[model samples]
Target: LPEELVHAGWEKCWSRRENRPYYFNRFTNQSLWEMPVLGQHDVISDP
Candidate 1:
């Protein structure tokens, strides 16, 4: 898919907390997750 279309189709998810930053992603929509910044090659949706 086009980057523009993909971005538009993608729901935005981001946050900041405890002097830390966080962001999230889904194929189309929410995961109802508390996702936070992690290693780019890390495992699982949770720690």
Candidate 2:
């Protein structure tokens, strides 16, 4: 997960087909199977 779980342009969504978590960006109409990454700095370090 990223430090900033929620991004400005990205949104969290659900896929009814597989009932899996999906990431979406309406501006770009982009969809991803995994959470969308904002940047390397946003990545969380293992604790």
Candidate 3:
């Protein structure tokens, strides 16, 4: 379930970035799992 969520988040982030031309700076490979709240889950679940 965690992996699925991460995958979905990444896909959404990547797609949003891909669709924009002027938002290049906002595009990042960093996943939601990298943030504090999300990262905590990743750490706890070790997924």
Error of 1 at 43 (Å): 12
> Model 3, 1-47: lDDT tens per residue?
24543443433233364553221112354444232223435455545
1-47: candidate 2 lDDT, tens digit per residue? 45454554667788788688888776688878887665556667788
Off by over 4 Å in 3: 10-47
The TM-score obtained by model 1 is 0.18
Model 2: residues with Cα > 4 Å off, grouped in runs = 1-8, 39-47
Q: How should the candidates be ordered by lDDT, best one leading?
A: 2, 1, 3
How many Å off is the CA of 42 in candidate 3? Answer: 26
Q: Please provide, for model 1 over 1-47, each residue's C-alpha lDDT reduced to its tens digit, 9 standing for 90 to 100.
A: 23543453433344444344333345535332333332346566764
Worst 10 residues of 1 by lDDT: 30-39
* lDDT for 7 (candidate 1): 55
Span of 10 residues, lowest total lDDT, candidate 2: 1-10
User: Each candidate's TM vs. the true structure?
Assistant: 0.18, 0.53, 0.18
Inter-residue clash pairs, candidate 1:
none
Task: List ranges where model 1 is wrong by over 4 Å.
Answer: 1-27, 36-39, 42-47
